[PDB]
């Protein structure tokens, strides 16, 4: 981000943008736990 | 000498004085933007959204010379150069293509222009003409006056013209539409065109709207096509399902027509879309005689014609071909350079179809 007047660099910023990726990163799944899975055991454990 | 390059300008006695100079130095020119979304926190400091195309969008307000009583959604507004406050609501645009569907006034057609099918146009008028001009029998006997009917008859013959005669005697603004005018390379908007059409008709002092080839519009969904020229499936129900009938209809009269009724969606067939259905055929002998009676007015001829025999020399045939044959007797006069048409011209002009179109 740069000055409007002299355009000299006022600050660096965290790289990149986009509200869509925010919406992809700010949705909540709710409260879940591995015990609240229907005993897929092996499967769940493999994913762990 | 130097050549002018199409610069215009009027002679001196027709311009200037101090008026033009004062007007230019005094009045601010107005840029044009589209309107949106009256913010309307409490309806005394409303504010609005505007869009200057390719440039920006702004939140703005009105100049107190104009009031929210004149501002709506879109509304084509005009503002000044620097503070962009609303100075004028601009008049509507002729772009929405409604103009090319317009007839806009009493058509040059009467209830005798119909070629013999006066029976059908009369049963039509029972359901559109009668329940606007003679409402003394509908709602008292129970039902709100109907407003819309369909037609189907011979190949592209006379069908539309009935609507024109009705709209003439109804004293109604007339609009006529084909499926093509609900279609563009830009999609989705094709459905929105019917919405625009009904709204712009209701901005008129009540209007009569007619559709042709309603088979191509009122035809139901075809899933097994798996694509293709698929715009129909996006647009057609917005006619069929947003269309209103005798009950749910505002101050509008509607008429349908197509040569092929077998494919039409029952939703169009059922009420809320249609209040009557009418069938036609190839003009009967009385009809064919009456069409030539009508067209005897359409030219200058040696008016001793045996139209009674001409209509019989025509076997099962249309009435559009009757018009074509009358103009073909005109062709007979032209090829002979004759100042008037004659019965022989009519006879061999009829045979032009009857022989060469059926040899």
């Amino acid at each position: 981000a740069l000055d409007m007047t002299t355009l000299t660099i006022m600050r660096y910023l965290p790289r990149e943008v986009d509200p869509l990726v925010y919406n992809m990163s700010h949705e909540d799944p709710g409260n879940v736990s591995y015990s609240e899975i229907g005993g897929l055991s092996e499967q769940i454990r493999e994913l762990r | 000498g130097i050549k002018e390059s199409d610069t215009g300008l009027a002679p001196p006695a027709l311009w200037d004085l101090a008026a033009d100079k004062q007007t230019l130095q005094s009045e601010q020119p107005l840029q044009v933007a589209r309107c949106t979304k009256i913010i309307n926190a409490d309806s005394e400091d409303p504010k609005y959204i505007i869009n200057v195309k390719q440039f920006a969008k702004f939140v703005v307000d009105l100049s107190d010379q104009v009031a929210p009583t004149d501002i709506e959604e879109g509304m084509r507004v005009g503002v000044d150069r620097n503070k962009y406050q609303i100075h004028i609501p601009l008049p509507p645009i002729a772009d929405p293509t409604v103009t090319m569907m317009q007839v806009e006034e009493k058509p040059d057609v009467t209830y005798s222009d119909v070629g013999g099918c006066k029976e059908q146009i009369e049963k039509l008028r029972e359901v559109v003409e009668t329940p606007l001009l003679h409402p003394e029998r509908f709602v008292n006997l129970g039902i709100e006056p109907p407003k819309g009917v369909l037609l189907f008859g011979p190949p592209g013959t006379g069908k539309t013209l009935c609507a024109r005669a009705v709209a003439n005697r109804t004293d109604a603004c007339f609009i006529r539409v084909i499926g093509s005018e609900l279609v563009q390379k830009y999609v989705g908007e094709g459905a929105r065109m019917v919405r625009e059409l009904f709204e712009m008709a209701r901005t008129k002092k009540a209007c009569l709207i007619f559709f042709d080839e309603i088979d191509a519009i009122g035809g139901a969904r075809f899933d097994d096509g798996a694509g293709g020229d698929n715009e129909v499936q996006r647009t057609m129900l917005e006619l069929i399902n947003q269309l209103d009938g005798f009950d749910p209809r505002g101050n509008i009269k509607v008429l349908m027509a197509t040569n092929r009724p077998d494919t039409l969606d029952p939703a169009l067939m059922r009420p809320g879309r249609l209040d009557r259905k009418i069938e036609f055929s190839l003009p009967d002998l009385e009809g064919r005689t009456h069409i030539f009676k009508i067209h005897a007015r359409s030219m200058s001829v040696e008016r001793d014609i045996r139209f009674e025999l001409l209509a019989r020399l025509c076997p099962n045939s249309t009435g559009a071909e009757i018009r074509s044959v009358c103009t073909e007797a005109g062709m007979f006069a032209i090829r002979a350079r004759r100042k008037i048409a004659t019965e022989k011209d009519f006879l061999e002009a009829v045979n032009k179809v009857i022989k060469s179109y059926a040899k």
């Binding site: 943008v17 509200p19 | 440039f55 920006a56 969008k57």
Partner: protein
């Protein structure tokens, strides 16, 4: 006087823009309807919780 300065410096017509995310070193990013892009070290007359990037 703080409120009346702020009121008289709302300026009445103003641009519209699309919100982009915030940062702490509180300060947000904005894309104009003129497709210009800007960074505000201070968001302004709206609190943080009114916002959705």
């Amino acid at each position: 006087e703080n409120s009346e300065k702020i009121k008289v410096n709302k300026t009445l017509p103003y641009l519209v823009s699309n919100v982009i995310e915030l940062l702490d070193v509180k300060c947000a990013v904005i894309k104009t309807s003129t497709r210009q892009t800007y960074f505000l070290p201070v968001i302004g007359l709206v609190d943080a919780e009114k916002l959705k990037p």
